[PDB]
Design a binder for this molecule. Structure first.
Ligand SMILES: O=C(c1ccc(C(=O)N2CCC(N3CCCC3)CC2)c(Nc2ccccc2)c1)N1CCC(N2CCCC2)CC1
Ligand SMILES: O=C(c1ccc(C(=O)N2CCC(N3CCCC3)CC2)c(Nc2ccccc2)c1)N1CCC(N2CCCC2)CC1
Lengths: 309, 306
């Protein structure tokens, strides 16, 4: 047995006001309709340009553990039931996307209608998944932070777009560095931002001009258009204040949601500290992550919460 | 309070025998000569083609926590005092290697002798560092450790002693990795055709109808001789056996671990008292896995089962 009200009194602290959490982080207004064994399509979190054949492996509160059919369960991952990068069976085909078939299946030999029959499986219904016009369009070029090497701002392209969300690709870099985002992302910048902020812009591998890079030459050579400066929107500040409490998914063992504290604040990030555990477990995370939640999110959703160690 | 002896009688299991461990995993012959502040050169574990200016941030047991000078403490990493990818000050200049200087330092403006006199620091004494058929330029077929389904066209781009650096042609260098002649991840040219596997050709190469012969002449390189690739005998680690394993998630800690599952060259470590979702695979010749008593013998704290 463990209550937040008693804990906030004992510690003499305040929770991050619920009003500071966005719709995808806040209390769901509905129940989790997903059931184990339901099939769907979805983005690979490690290879974000790839759509894979997924199966609901576990249902816990408002979250689902997704399994990559035919692949090892060591690759299994957690998402909320309202996640944006999960889609119903037939979505890739209807929206013009390439779907990676299960392991040992060739694209040219994969059919959903026949696969669900073979598996004696049911597709996750379309309703379990049930836009402000942005300036971004597929093919558009900008400057973006390589989230894996954050000291690098590179030449990038919008290579995919789903509703108001788009996939950032780094030209002539492999696709494992790709990531999804939106107009207000603090990681994306318009062409010329780097020169303006006295920053080095990392140029495409194999591109002869490294130190003498011209955006206008590159845009002619690639027959591309730049993302308009006006398509980029201001990210309002989160407002989360140091020492404030919340609920955070453990990056390490994501099956758990733990009692967290805002250890330190950034302009768009927060430093999660898991109460009881040592300061070495602390890490940075975006304050608009669907993996950070308000106090009682676990209690309300039916998700077990890990009290302080 | 905790002991391995009482734990072995209570849980009714026998430990991974001392003999089954390699020289870099077993009980060391000497004490830890390193001290906090000592400066050195060493390979970046996440960019294995890069040599960096390091400082002994922390000394604990037969281990050292190393700091990348000028860069965040968030990149600090742990190695054993007898690690092979750490070198004394001046080694890169001696061996014609490229040393990456501290943050904000240009290669053209860095000098150890002056840098040490600026940080009022001492170099790690050379004495602390006194611990193959492959040659630099040789081509082989290697497994991409980050994406193991992939076997690709690779070159040996560096060689230090009997250890060499595997680089994937026309892929970024963050995929590079150091290994030895007995590694299961490396194979001779033609092993994929021979084993009815797909060989990942270099990005930008026209074919993927790929030819190793056209490519070897184009690049003007030699393929590693099939004889240089040496056989690795199996570890002999039976399931339920006990040992000490460095936690990958928080490597400042070494914990009580069981051999949950076994492979030909790998073992599935299970941290006792923890959920099976913490369990991970690891090479059996890893210097992060040690025999029962290694922490107590070296002065490193051991983590009991949770
Ligand atoms: O990043 C990759 C990579 C790795 C893997 C897949 C892949 O086979 N996928 C199917 C299986 C899936 N999940 C399901 C279960 C968990 C893994 C990942 C996507 C992949 N495919 C792909 C094809 C087309 C377009 C873009 C990507 C590309 N490489 C750069 C790094 C490369 N290596 C660098 C060193 C040598 C090669 C290897 C390829
Ligand atoms: O792999 C890299 C990479 C990343 C970083 C460094 C780097 O700045 N280094 C200095 C600092 C050090 N440590 C010290 C503290 C921890 C980090 C690593 C080496 C680097 N340099 C380098 C130059 C020459 C030769 C080989 C490497 C290349 N990229 C492919 C992936 C790239 N991104 C892909 C998407 C867009 C860009 C970015 C660059």
């Amino acid at each position: 047995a463990w209550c937040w009200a008693s804990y906030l009194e004992e510690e003499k602290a305040v929770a991050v006001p619920a009003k500071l959490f966005k719709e995808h982080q806040s209390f769901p207004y509905n129940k989790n309709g997903f059931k184990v064994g339901m099939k769907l399509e979805g983005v690979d979190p490690e290879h974000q340009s790839v759509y894979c054949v997924l199966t609901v492996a576990e249902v816990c509160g408002y979250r689902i553990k997704l399994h990559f059919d035919g692949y090892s369960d060591c690759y299994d991952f957690w998402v909320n039931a309202d996640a944006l990068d999960i889609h119903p069976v037939g979505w890739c085909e209807k929206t013009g996307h390439k779907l990676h078939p299960p392991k040992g299946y060739k694209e040219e030999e994969f059919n959903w209608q026949t696969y669900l029959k073979t598996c004696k499986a049911q597709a996750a219904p379309k309703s379990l998944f049930e836009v402000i016009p942005s300036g971004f369009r597929v093919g558009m070029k900008l400057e973006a932070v390589d989230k894996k090497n954050p000291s690098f701002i590179c030449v990038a392209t919008v290579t995919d777009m789903v509703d108001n969300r788009f996939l950032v690709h780094f030209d002539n870099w492999d696709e494992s560095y790709d990531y999804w985002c939106e107009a207000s992302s603090p990681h994306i910048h318009p062409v010329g931002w780097c020169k303006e902020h006295r920053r080095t812009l990392i140029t495409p591998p194999g591109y002869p001009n490294v130190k003498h890079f011209s955006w206008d030459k590159y845009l002619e050579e690639t027959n591309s258009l730049p993302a308009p400066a006006r398509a980029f929107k201001v990210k309002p500040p989160h407002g989360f204040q140091k020492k404030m409490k919340l609920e955070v998914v453990d990056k390490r063992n994501p099956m758990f949601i733990r009692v967290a504290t805002v250890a330190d604040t950034d302009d768009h990030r927060v430093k999660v500290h898991f109460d009881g555990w040592n300061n070495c477990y602390d890490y940075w995370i975006d304050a608009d992550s669907p993996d950070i939640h308000p106090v009682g999110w676990c209690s309300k959703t039916g998700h077990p919460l890990q009290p302080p160690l």
